Design a protein around this ligand. Structure first.
Ligand SMILES: Cc1cn([C@H]2C[C@H](O)[C@@H](COP(=O)(O)OP(=O)(O)O)O2)c(=O)[nH]c1=O
Lengths: 175, 175
């Protein structure tokens, strides 16, 4: 079934689904609610989002929806590959302000469980990258916030010098 | 938000989500539980399946899981394109044994809600097609059944003369 590759910051989980291949292609259960609960991931997802980025080096984030509408996310890459970063913003947390960069791709089929209290963003590594992610709380343009990609406090080693960013993404606040 | 393009057999719906496109690519809510409810679609999906077919002309199906463990399927195409066919197998229906073929692609983003009581299958149209589908009941081996892709009564004008099938799909029982 689906298995845990690593756990970081207590609750963040890098996961891998069991693939079943043939000469014809493959099959996989990319999500199984009851399986996830066994792996200590109990969430009822309400929305699935799909992000398409035409050019490599496109940066999406760092996003976080402020409470009372915080979102648990579960991200995967359907086409292409991305360098995904998560930052622990729980002030109480022993791992507060810490981050981690993961490579999620169409070939590795890896998924990342981003808990509530974290900032999340990614950098596409090749053209035509498609990212899909579930959220357990509906979107709220009101509570939609984030952290500027190049915040010097975090000093994230993005694999791009001049990222393709939306104007909205270039004016996100610092940490 | 999401729009119902057409409805057939009383309950099967061809859906299309809202797509926010800009200079960098696009973003869309492929699944939204609340939105679907407002359209008349209410189900608790517990499993997401992914199917990758290397070559064009690969037929997967026709398939249904036996009652009482029938499954509602929400079909979507993440890469490539398919000719998706559903067949009404509800003995107590005014459309029993009728079928419809739909074209779902990564470029149209259309989705198909296949009710419990229908057989479902598809033929990939281009190489490397990826199909994702959500189900409201888990996979149950003992309840696995289907209809022969080239069954004589079903008219199904598949767009492939010699398709690629698994050994078990060639074995599937006739209606
Ligand atoms: C339909 C389904 C299949 N599977 C497994 C059972 C099979 O061993 C494998 C492939 O499914 P299937 O398409 O039935 O096999 P074939 O390729 O021979 O037609 O996937 C699941 O784990 N979950 C599911 O929901």
């Amino acid at each position: 079934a689906m298995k845990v590759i690593e756990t970081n910051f207590t609750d963040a989980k890098l996961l891998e689904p069991r693939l079943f291949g043939d000469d014809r292609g493959f099959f996989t259960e990319s999500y199984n609610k009851k399986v996830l609960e066994t792996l200590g991931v109990t969430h009822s997802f309400v929305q699935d989002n799909v992000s398409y980025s035409a050019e490599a080096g496109t940066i999406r984030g760092l996003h976080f929806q402020k409470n009372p509408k915080a979102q648990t996310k579960l991200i995967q890459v359907m086409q292409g590959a991305i360098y995904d970063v998560i930052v622990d913003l729980r002030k109480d947390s022993p791992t507060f302000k810490q981050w981690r960069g993961y490579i999620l791709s169409a070939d590795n089929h890896r998924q990342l469980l981003v808990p509530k209290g974290f900032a999340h963003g990614f950098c596409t590594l090749v053209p035509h990258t498609i990212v899909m992610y579930k959220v357990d709380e509906y979107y709220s343009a009101d509570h939609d916030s984030g952290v500027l990609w190049n915040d010097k406090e975090l000093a994230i080693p993005w694999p791009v010098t001049s990222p393709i960013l939306s104007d909205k993404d270039r004016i996100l606040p610092l940490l």
